[PDB]
Amino acid sequence: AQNPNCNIMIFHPTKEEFNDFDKYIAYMESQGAHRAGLAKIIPPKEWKARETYDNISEILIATPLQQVASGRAGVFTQYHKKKKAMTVGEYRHLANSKKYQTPPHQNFEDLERKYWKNRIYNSPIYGADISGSLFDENTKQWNLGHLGTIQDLLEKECGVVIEGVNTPYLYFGMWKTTFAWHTEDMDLYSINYLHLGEPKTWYVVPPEHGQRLERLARELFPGSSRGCGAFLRHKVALISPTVLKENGIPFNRITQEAGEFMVTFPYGYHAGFNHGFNCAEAINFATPRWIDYGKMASQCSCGEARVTFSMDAFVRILQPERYDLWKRGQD
Ligand SMILES: O=C(O)CNC(=O)C(=O)O
Ligand SMILES: [Mg+2]
Ligand code: NI
Ligand SMILES: [Zn+2]
């Protein structure tokens, strides 16, 4: 069995190997990369996502989200308070202000210590989940707006044609902006490209151990767990690495820098935080190996998770027993 300790693997494809996206994902899996839940892909040196980032300041962040924490420094929830619209130029200036800027630090480890000590005492503003792309249309390799769609994969594997579309999302971050512990919708893959700015630190639980994280989360968030049998689908709970180690939960960590891709694998729980002003692009995707995860994915039916249009068909086809309850939660 490849990668039996479920370490995060880092790949350096050549320009030739960068041509065929599906083939390369399958290669990484042949080497055991999915056992970690997360892999890093460093593009060949010949590649670029676009020519420059000099002209992005007029992008609008229609609904910036202030991420307000409740709890203790290592075990907390966050809720999102909606703020007034602002441009990417305005958001960048805000990120760099004295109130929000990254503190002085020695290295990534010192900054990680500072994040876990102090996150809860601040409420950073995240420009998350903005439909759009920063890949140039002429970028033919690993262009996250030109991937094969999940609807087409389901149709190729299962023979059923379904409605829905699959487009990327932009994320504009600042120091301490945070992504809570989650797997993807329908336990899909994700791919995330850090276009510019400061790093993103990731934490991940191997898919084979995801239920250990779920059991800890039910213990640590007991109100939330009574409310919903899949409350991590609400994407609000944070647990620090120290607390994970105290409770024997297997995990790994890595820091993504600008110009790098990360891939999350089906049922790989992940969480993390941004170091300072940055912009990432991410999208979900599927492969043949995903189908069995999609069929078994948990679902939130309490009302909280509320998701895209395109999840309907995935539930309806892959999980017909669950469909009626889940759809009630959508309505
Ligand atoms: O970058 C973020 O805030 C969150 N990203 C992801 O969870 C992802 O790409 O799967
Ligand atoms: Mg612009
Ligand atoms: Ni994710
Ligand atoms: Zn729920």
mmCIF file of C-alpha atoms and ligand atoms in Angstrom:
data_model
loop_
_atom_site.group_PDB
_atom_site.id
_atom_site.type_symbol
_atom_site.label_atom_id
_atom_site.label_comp_id
_atom_site.label_asym_id
_atom_site.label_seq_id
_atom_site.Cartn_x
_atom_site.Cartn_y
_atom_site.Cartn_z
ATOM 1 C CA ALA A 1 0.000 0.000 0.000
ATOM 2 C CA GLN A 2 1.504 3.336 -1.052
ATOM 3 C CA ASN A 3 1.869 6.132 1.549
ATOM 4 C CA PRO A 4 0.692 4.052 4.503
ATOM 5 C CA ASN A 5 1.414 6.809 7.068
ATOM 6 C CA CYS A 6 -0.879 9.188 5.045
ATOM 7 C CA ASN A 7 1.699 11.918 4.691
ATOM 8 C CA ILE A 8 1.002 14.965 2.569
ATOM 9 C CA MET A 9 2.827 14.487 -0.737
ATOM 10 C CA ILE A 10 4.282 17.238 -2.912
ATOM 11 C CA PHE A 11 4.460 16.856 -6.668
ATOM 12 C CA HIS A 12 6.554 18.577 -9.304
ATOM 13 C CA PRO A 13 4.991 17.659 -12.709
ATOM 14 C CA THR A 14 6.919 18.464 -15.845
ATOM 15 C CA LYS A 15 5.314 20.590 -18.535
ATOM 16 C CA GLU A 16 4.446 17.437 -20.410
ATOM 17 C CA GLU A 17 2.882 15.816 -17.376
ATOM 18 C CA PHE A 18 0.856 19.059 -16.831
ATOM 19 C CA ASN A 19 -1.145 18.572 -19.995
ATOM 20 C CA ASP A 20 -3.610 15.944 -18.970
ATOM 21 C CA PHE A 21 -5.239 16.879 -15.643
ATOM 22 C CA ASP A 22 -7.191 13.630 -15.053
ATOM 23 C CA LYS A 23 -4.157 11.509 -15.834
ATOM 24 C CA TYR A 24 -2.021 13.408 -13.329
ATOM 25 C CA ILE A 25 -4.624 13.084 -10.529
ATOM 26 C CA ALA A 26 -4.709 9.365 -11.188
ATOM 27 C CA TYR A 27 -0.898 9.274 -11.068
ATOM 28 C CA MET A 28 -0.819 11.048 -7.729
ATOM 29 C CA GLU A 29 -3.289 8.520 -6.387
ATOM 30 C CA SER A 30 -1.146 5.648 -7.737
ATOM 31 C CA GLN A 31 1.546 7.007 -5.438
ATOM 32 C CA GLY A 32 -0.836 7.097 -2.414
ATOM 33 C CA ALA A 33 -1.380 10.862 -2.327
ATOM 34 C CA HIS A 34 -5.044 10.616 -1.487
ATOM 35 C CA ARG A 35 -4.365 8.793 1.713
ATOM 36 C CA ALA A 36 -3.338 12.127 3.278
ATOM 37 C CA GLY A 37 -6.518 13.909 2.214
ATOM 38 C CA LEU A 38 -4.458 16.748 0.676
ATOM 39 C CA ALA A 39 -1.556 17.072 -1.847
ATOM 40 C CA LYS A 40 0.496 19.991 -3.068
ATOM 41 C CA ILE A 41 1.263 20.447 -6.778
ATOM 42 C CA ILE A 42 4.049 22.846 -7.779
ATOM 43 C CA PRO A 43 3.491 23.790 -11.486
ATOM 44 C CA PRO A 44 6.393 23.475 -13.936
ATOM 45 C CA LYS A 45 8.495 26.577 -14.246
ATOM 46 C CA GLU A 46 7.258 27.212 -17.813
ATOM 47 C CA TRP A 47 3.653 27.635 -16.596
ATOM 48 C CA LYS A 48 1.725 30.677 -15.581
ATOM 49 C CA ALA A 49 -1.904 31.272 -14.599
ATOM 50 C CA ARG A 50 -2.044 34.704 -16.266
ATOM 51 C CA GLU A 51 0.417 37.438 -17.253
ATOM 52 C CA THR A 52 0.006 39.796 -14.300
ATOM 53 C CA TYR A 53 -2.264 40.593 -11.356
ATOM 54 C CA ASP A 54 -1.985 44.341 -11.918
ATOM 55 C CA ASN A 55 -5.550 44.912 -12.951
ATOM 56 C CA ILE A 56 -7.722 43.071 -10.333
ATOM 57 C CA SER A 57 -8.560 45.917 -7.977
ATOM 58 C CA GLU A 58 -11.949 46.646 -9.455
ATOM 59 C CA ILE A 59 -13.322 43.139 -8.821
ATOM 60 C CA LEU A 60 -16.251 43.531 -6.339
ATOM 61 C CA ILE A 61 -16.610 41.648 -3.138
ATOM 62 C CA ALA A 62 -20.396 42.066 -2.858
ATOM 63 C CA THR A 63 -20.697 40.493 0.578
ATOM 64 C CA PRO A 64 -17.520 40.534 2.656
ATOM 65 C CA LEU A 65 -17.861 38.301 5.698
ATOM 66 C CA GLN A 66 -16.608 39.316 9.218
ATOM 67 C CA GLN A 67 -15.637 36.079 10.923
ATOM 68 C CA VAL A 68 -16.610 36.371 14.567
ATOM 69 C CA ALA A 69 -15.422 33.627 16.960
ATOM 70 C CA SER A 70 -17.024 32.151 20.111
ATOM 71 C CA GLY A 71 -15.377 29.651 22.443
ATOM 72 C CA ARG A 72 -11.860 29.005 23.626
ATOM 73 C CA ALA A 73 -8.630 29.615 21.713
ATOM 74 C CA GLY A 74 -8.260 26.025 20.513
ATOM 75 C CA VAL A 75 -11.958 25.066 20.267
ATOM 76 C CA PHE A 76 -14.279 27.648 18.793
ATOM 77 C CA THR A 77 -17.026 28.335 16.320
ATOM 78 C CA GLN A 78 -17.176 31.233 13.896
ATOM 79 C CA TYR A 79 -20.155 33.003 12.388
ATOM 80 C CA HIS A 80 -20.176 35.227 9.469
ATOM 81 C CA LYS A 81 -21.463 38.753 9.767
ATOM 82 C CA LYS A 82 -22.224 40.342 6.400
ATOM 83 C CA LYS A 83 -20.524 43.693 5.683
ATOM 84 C CA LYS A 84 -21.055 46.299 3.009
ATOM 85 C CA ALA A 85 -19.635 45.684 -0.483
ATOM 86 C CA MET A 86 -16.172 46.687 -1.311
ATOM 87 C CA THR A 87 -13.706 46.382 -4.191
ATOM 88 C CA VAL A 88 -10.637 44.178 -4.100
ATOM 89 C CA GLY A 89 -8.586 47.422 -3.936
ATOM 90 C CA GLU A 90 -10.506 48.581 -0.942
ATOM 91 C CA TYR A 91 -10.264 45.130 0.692
ATOM 92 C CA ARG A 92 -6.493 44.991 0.101
ATOM 93 C CA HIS A 93 -6.068 48.362 1.811
ATOM 94 C CA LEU A 94 -8.170 47.129 4.735
ATOM 95 C CA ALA A 95 -6.138 43.904 5.019
ATOM 96 C CA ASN A 96 -2.915 46.001 5.153
ATOM 97 C CA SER A 97 -4.267 48.427 7.796
ATOM 98 C CA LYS A 98 -2.885 48.424 11.313
ATOM 99 C CA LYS A 99 -6.100 46.803 12.635
ATOM 100 C CA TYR A 100 -5.895 43.798 10.276
ATOM 101 C CA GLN A 101 -2.305 43.382 9.066
ATOM 102 C CA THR A 102 -0.134 40.370 9.788
ATOM 103 C CA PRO A 103 1.991 40.981 12.942
ATOM 104 C CA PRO A 104 5.732 40.819 12.941
ATOM 105 C CA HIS A 105 6.850 37.231 13.123
ATOM 106 C CA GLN A 106 9.952 35.094 12.703
ATOM 107 C CA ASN A 107 8.755 32.365 10.383
ATOM 108 C CA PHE A 108 5.619 30.345 9.479
ATOM 109 C CA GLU A 109 5.796 28.408 12.743
ATOM 110 C CA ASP A 110 5.827 31.528 14.867
ATOM 111 C CA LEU A 111 2.882 32.894 12.905
ATOM 112 C CA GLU A 112 0.973 29.627 13.359
ATOM 113 C CA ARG A 113 1.552 29.875 17.134
ATOM 114 C CA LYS A 114 0.256 33.434 17.085
ATOM 115 C CA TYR A 115 -2.829 32.393 15.054
ATOM 116 C CA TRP A 116 -3.847 29.709 17.530
ATOM 117 C CA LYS A 117 -3.146 31.866 20.566
ATOM 118 C CA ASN A 118 -4.939 34.941 19.333
ATOM 119 C CA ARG A 119 -7.404 34.216 16.541
ATOM 120 C CA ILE A 120 -10.477 34.342 18.721
ATOM 121 C CA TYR A 121 -9.759 37.879 19.871
ATOM 122 C CA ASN A 122 -10.105 39.344 16.432
ATOM 123 C CA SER A 123 -12.766 39.327 13.690
ATOM 124 C CA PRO A 124 -11.028 39.373 10.264
ATOM 125 C CA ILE A 125 -13.033 40.031 7.084
ATOM 126 C CA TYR A 126 -13.005 37.292 4.340
ATOM 127 C CA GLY A 127 -14.047 37.859 0.670
ATOM 128 C CA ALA A 128 -15.049 34.295 0.154
ATOM 129 C CA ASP A 129 -17.056 32.406 -2.279
ATOM 130 C CA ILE A 130 -17.075 34.936 -5.235
ATOM 131 C CA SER A 131 -18.064 33.288 -8.523
ATOM 132 C CA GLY A 132 -15.350 33.982 -11.113
ATOM 133 C CA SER A 133 -11.867 33.139 -12.370
ATOM 134 C CA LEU A 134 -8.434 34.736 -12.655
ATOM 135 C CA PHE A 135 -7.003 32.189 -15.115
ATOM 136 C CA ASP A 136 -6.267 33.647 -18.541
ATOM 137 C CA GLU A 137 -8.412 32.041 -21.210
ATOM 138 C CA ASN A 138 -5.252 31.156 -23.029
ATOM 139 C CA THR A 139 -3.901 29.106 -20.141
ATOM 140 C CA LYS A 140 -4.594 25.587 -21.285
ATOM 141 C CA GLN A 141 -3.043 23.536 -18.438
ATOM 142 C CA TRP A 142 -4.690 23.345 -14.994
ATOM 143 C CA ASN A 143 -7.061 26.166 -15.779
ATOM 144 C CA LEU A 144 -9.691 25.804 -13.026
ATOM 145 C CA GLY A 145 -12.396 27.337 -15.244
ATOM 146 C CA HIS A 146 -11.825 24.663 -17.990
ATOM 147 C CA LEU A 147 -12.016 21.469 -16.083
ATOM 148 C CA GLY A 148 -14.333 18.589 -16.954
ATOM 149 C CA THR A 149 -17.572 19.129 -15.072
ATOM 150 C CA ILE A 150 -18.878 16.917 -12.280
ATOM 151 C CA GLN A 151 -22.148 16.509 -14.165
ATOM 152 C CA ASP A 152 -20.269 15.157 -17.142
ATOM 153 C CA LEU A 153 -18.292 12.758 -14.872
ATOM 154 C CA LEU A 154 -21.468 11.437 -13.265
ATOM 155 C CA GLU A 155 -22.928 10.986 -16.726
ATOM 156 C CA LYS A 156 -19.854 9.182 -18.001
ATOM 157 C CA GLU A 157 -19.718 6.834 -14.974
ATOM 158 C CA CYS A 158 -23.359 6.172 -14.354
ATOM 159 C CA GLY A 159 -25.095 6.938 -17.700
ATOM 160 C CA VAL A 160 -27.523 9.498 -16.305
ATOM 161 C CA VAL A 161 -27.670 13.013 -17.706
ATOM 162 C CA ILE A 162 -28.311 15.682 -15.109
ATOM 163 C CA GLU A 163 -28.854 19.442 -14.859
ATOM 164 C CA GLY A 164 -26.282 21.679 -13.133
ATOM 165 C CA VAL A 165 -23.156 23.564 -13.670
ATOM 166 C CA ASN A 166 -19.713 23.645 -11.981
ATOM 167 C CA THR A 167 -17.808 27.003 -11.871
ATOM 168 C CA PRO A 168 -14.902 28.329 -9.837
ATOM 169 C CA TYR A 169 -14.831 30.635 -6.874
ATOM 170 C CA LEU A 170 -12.464 33.380 -5.758
ATOM 171 C CA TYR A 171 -11.364 33.927 -2.164
ATOM 172 C CA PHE A 172 -9.777 37.159 -1.035
ATOM 173 C CA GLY A 173 -8.200 36.673 2.413
ATOM 174 C CA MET A 174 -6.417 38.589 5.128
ATOM 175 C CA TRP A 175 -4.524 37.668 8.293
ATOM 176 C CA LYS A 176 -6.505 35.282 10.476
ATOM 177 C CA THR A 177 -9.256 34.585 7.942
ATOM 178 C CA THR A 178 -10.222 31.053 8.575
ATOM 179 C CA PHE A 179 -11.741 28.036 6.893
ATOM 180 C CA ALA A 180 -13.493 25.731 9.327
ATOM 181 C CA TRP A 181 -13.186 21.932 9.466
ATOM 182 C CA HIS A 182 -15.067 20.395 6.527
ATOM 183 C CA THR A 183 -15.162 17.992 3.670
ATOM 184 C CA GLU A 184 -16.447 19.129 0.309
ATOM 185 C CA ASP A 185 -20.094 18.985 -0.762
ATOM 186 C CA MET A 186 -20.929 15.363 -1.524
ATOM 187 C CA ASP A 187 -17.315 14.519 -0.415
ATOM 188 C CA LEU A 188 -16.034 15.795 -3.793
ATOM 189 C CA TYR A 189 -12.427 16.684 -4.529
ATOM 190 C CA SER A 190 -11.358 20.287 -4.453
ATOM 191 C CA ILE A 191 -8.497 22.066 -6.162
ATOM 192 C CA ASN A 192 -7.226 25.418 -4.918
ATOM 193 C CA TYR A 193 -4.747 27.718 -6.602
ATOM 194 C CA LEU A 194 -3.126 30.514 -4.622
ATOM 195 C CA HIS A 195 -2.893 33.276 -7.244
ATOM 196 C CA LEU A 196 -1.143 35.932 -5.236
ATOM 197 C CA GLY A 197 -0.141 37.263 -1.877
ATOM 198 C CA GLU A 198 0.549 35.708 1.454
ATOM 199 C CA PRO A 199 0.392 32.008 2.306
ATOM 200 C CA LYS A 200 -2.431 29.725 3.390
ATOM 201 C CA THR A 201 -1.819 27.091 6.109
ATOM 202 C CA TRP A 202 -3.794 23.852 5.848
ATOM 203 C CA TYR A 203 -4.617 21.117 8.306
ATOM 204 C CA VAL A 204 -6.010 17.766 7.056
ATOM 205 C CA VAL A 205 -7.256 14.450 8.437
ATOM 206 C CA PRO A 206 -6.666 11.305 6.317
ATOM 207 C CA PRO A 207 -9.971 10.108 4.770
ATOM 208 C CA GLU A 208 -9.578 6.721 6.442
ATOM 209 C CA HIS A 209 -9.692 8.536 9.810
ATOM 210 C CA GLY A 210 -12.380 11.078 9.182
ATOM 211 C CA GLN A 211 -14.838 9.499 11.566
ATOM 212 C CA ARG A 212 -12.284 10.047 14.427
ATOM 213 C CA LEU A 213 -12.469 13.742 13.766
ATOM 214 C CA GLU A 214 -16.283 13.595 13.647
ATOM 215 C CA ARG A 215 -16.449 11.810 16.995
ATOM 216 C CA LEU A 216 -14.211 14.429 18.605
ATOM 217 C CA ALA A 217 -16.237 17.219 17.085
ATOM 218 C CA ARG A 218 -19.462 15.790 18.571
ATOM 219 C CA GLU A 219 -17.750 15.789 21.983
ATOM 220 C CA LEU A 220 -16.407 19.311 21.634
ATOM 221 C CA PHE A 221 -19.485 20.898 20.136
ATOM 222 C CA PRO A 222 -22.231 19.077 21.963
ATOM 223 C CA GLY A 223 -25.122 21.589 21.281
ATOM 224 C CA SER A 224 -24.276 21.670 17.586
ATOM 225 C CA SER A 225 -24.150 17.890 17.423
ATOM 226 C CA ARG A 226 -27.615 17.562 18.960
ATOM 227 C CA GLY A 227 -28.926 20.037 16.424
ATOM 228 C CA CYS A 228 -27.620 18.189 13.377
ATOM 229 C CA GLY A 229 -26.162 14.735 12.714
ATOM 230 C CA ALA A 230 -23.754 16.310 10.116
ATOM 231 C CA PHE A 231 -23.036 19.656 11.668
ATOM 232 C CA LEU A 232 -19.550 19.914 10.248
ATOM 233 C CA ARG A 233 -21.391 20.581 6.967
ATOM 234 C CA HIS A 234 -22.215 24.000 8.501
ATOM 235 C CA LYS A 235 -18.564 24.888 8.199
ATOM 236 C CA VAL A 236 -18.262 26.742 11.499
ATOM 237 C CA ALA A 237 -16.123 24.597 13.867
ATOM 238 C CA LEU A 238 -12.436 25.024 14.564
ATOM 239 C CA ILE A 239 -10.179 22.713 16.556
ATOM 240 C CA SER A 240 -6.487 23.484 16.953
ATOM 241 C CA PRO A 241 -3.599 21.155 16.224
ATOM 242 C CA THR A 242 -2.775 21.057 19.904
ATOM 243 C CA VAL A 243 -6.285 19.861 20.758
ATOM 244 C CA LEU A 244 -6.191 17.332 17.932
ATOM 245 C CA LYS A 245 -2.847 15.927 19.256
ATOM 246 C CA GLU A 246 -4.212 15.792 22.840
ATOM 247 C CA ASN A 247 -7.064 13.676 21.552
ATOM 248 C CA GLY A 248 -4.996 11.393 19.363
ATOM 249 C CA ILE A 249 -6.558 12.511 16.055
ATOM 250 C CA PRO A 250 -4.325 11.774 13.085
ATOM 251 C CA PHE A 251 -3.632 14.871 10.991
ATOM 252 C CA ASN A 252 -1.026 16.714 8.959
ATOM 253 C CA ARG A 253 -0.250 20.313 8.152
ATOM 254 C CA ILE A 254 1.321 22.213 5.277
ATOM 255 C CA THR A 255 1.640 25.799 4.096
ATOM 256 C CA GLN A 256 0.661 26.738 0.512
ATOM 257 C CA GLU A 257 2.421 29.652 -1.100
ATOM 258 C CA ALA A 258 1.524 31.776 -4.084
ATOM 259 C CA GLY A 259 1.836 29.900 -7.359
ATOM 260 C CA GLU A 260 1.002 26.511 -5.824
ATOM 261 C CA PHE A 261 -1.994 24.197 -6.148
ATOM 262 C CA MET A 262 -3.542 22.126 -3.418
ATOM 263 C CA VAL A 263 -5.877 19.196 -4.059
ATOM 264 C CA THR A 264 -8.211 17.891 -1.413
ATOM 265 C CA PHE A 265 -9.389 14.300 -1.820
ATOM 266 C CA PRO A 266 -12.842 12.813 -1.148
ATOM 267 C CA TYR A 267 -13.694 12.820 2.542
ATOM 268 C CA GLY A 268 -10.428 14.582 3.494
ATOM 269 C CA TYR A 269 -11.409 16.930 6.312
ATOM 270 C CA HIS A 270 -9.484 20.188 6.125
ATOM 271 C CA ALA A 271 -9.250 23.566 7.908
ATOM 272 C CA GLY A 272 -6.810 26.451 7.863
ATOM 273 C CA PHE A 273 -6.033 30.116 7.787
ATOM 274 C CA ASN A 274 -4.523 32.877 5.694
ATOM 275 C CA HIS A 275 -1.297 34.655 6.618
ATOM 276 C CA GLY A 276 -2.125 38.034 5.164
ATOM 277 C CA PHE A 277 -3.741 39.559 2.040
ATOM 278 C CA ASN A 278 -4.134 36.882 -0.670
ATOM 279 C CA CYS A 279 -6.322 35.632 -3.451
ATOM 280 C CA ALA A 280 -7.141 31.979 -4.122
ATOM 281 C CA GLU A 281 -9.351 30.250 -6.694
ATOM 282 C CA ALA A 282 -10.967 26.896 -6.046
ATOM 283 C CA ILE A 283 -13.465 24.503 -7.586
ATOM 284 C CA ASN A 284 -14.845 21.065 -6.883
ATOM 285 C CA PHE A 285 -14.221 18.166 -9.265
ATOM 286 C CA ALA A 286 -14.849 14.445 -9.501
ATOM 287 C CA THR A 287 -13.116 11.332 -10.819
ATOM 288 C CA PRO A 288 -14.375 7.773 -11.149
ATOM 289 C CA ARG A 289 -13.041 7.002 -7.660
ATOM 290 C CA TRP A 290 -15.243 9.726 -6.139
ATOM 291 C CA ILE A 291 -18.541 8.007 -7.033
ATOM 292 C CA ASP A 292 -18.395 5.605 -4.086
ATOM 293 C CA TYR A 293 -17.726 8.494 -1.720
ATOM 294 C CA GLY A 294 -20.528 10.543 -3.153
ATOM 295 C CA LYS A 295 -22.989 7.726 -2.578
ATOM 296 C CA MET A 296 -22.009 7.497 1.121
ATOM 297 C CA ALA A 297 -21.587 11.228 1.916
ATOM 298 C CA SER A 298 -23.330 12.515 4.984
ATOM 299 C CA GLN A 299 -25.788 15.101 4.666
ATOM 300 C CA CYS A 300 -27.127 18.067 6.706
ATOM 301 C CA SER A 301 -30.941 18.156 6.596
ATOM 302 C CA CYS A 302 -31.453 20.666 9.512
ATOM 303 C CA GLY A 303 -31.519 23.674 7.281
ATOM 304 C CA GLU A 304 -28.210 25.212 8.118
ATOM 305 C CA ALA A 305 -25.878 23.994 5.379
ATOM 306 C CA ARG A 306 -27.820 25.443 2.356
ATOM 307 C CA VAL A 307 -25.859 24.732 -0.858
ATOM 308 C CA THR A 308 -25.786 25.219 -4.587
ATOM 309 C CA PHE A 309 -28.307 24.357 -7.193
ATOM 310 C CA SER A 310 -26.126 21.578 -8.566
ATOM 311 C CA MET A 311 -26.142 19.454 -5.419
ATOM 312 C CA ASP A 312 -29.730 18.533 -5.980
ATOM 313 C CA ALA A 313 -28.996 16.095 -8.766
ATOM 314 C CA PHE A 314 -26.081 14.540 -6.924
ATOM 315 C CA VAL A 315 -28.298 13.681 -3.947
ATOM 316 C CA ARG A 316 -31.209 12.704 -6.136
ATOM 317 C CA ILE A 317 -29.218 10.216 -8.227
ATOM 318 C CA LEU A 318 -26.621 8.981 -5.779
ATOM 319 C CA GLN A 319 -28.643 9.055 -2.560
ATOM 320 C CA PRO A 320 -32.326 8.596 -3.458
ATOM 321 C CA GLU A 321 -33.286 7.331 0.045
ATOM 322 C CA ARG A 322 -31.921 10.560 1.594
ATOM 323 C CA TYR A 323 -33.271 12.893 -1.069
ATOM 324 C CA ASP A 324 -36.677 13.811 0.356
ATOM 325 C CA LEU A 325 -35.291 14.669 3.838
ATOM 326 C CA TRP A 326 -32.345 16.565 2.454
ATOM 327 C CA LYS A 327 -34.571 18.569 0.042
ATOM 328 C CA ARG A 328 -36.867 19.569 2.962
ATOM 329 C CA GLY A 329 -33.709 21.026 4.569
ATOM 330 C CA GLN A 330 -33.073 23.009 1.406
ATOM 331 C CA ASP A 331 -36.683 24.469 1.625
HETATM 332 O O1 LIG B 1 -9.337 28.729 0.803
HETATM 333 C C1 LIG B 1 -10.342 28.589 1.565
HETATM 334 O O2 LIG B 1 -10.819 29.487 2.337
HETATM 335 C C2 LIG B 1 -11.089 27.304 1.688
HETATM 336 N N1 LIG B 1 -10.748 26.383 0.573
HETATM 337 C C3 LIG B 1 -11.124 25.124 0.568
HETATM 338 O O3 LIG B 1 -11.756 24.589 1.544
HETATM 339 C C4 LIG B 1 -10.817 24.284 -0.598
HETATM 340 O O4 LIG B 1 -10.165 24.739 -1.539
HETATM 341 O O5 LIG B 1 -11.323 23.128 -0.554
HETATM 342 MG MG MG B 2 -10.367 44.845 -11.738
HETATM 343 NI NI NI B 3 -12.594 22.820 1.096
HETATM 344 ZN ZN ZN B 4 -27.300 20.770 9.732
#
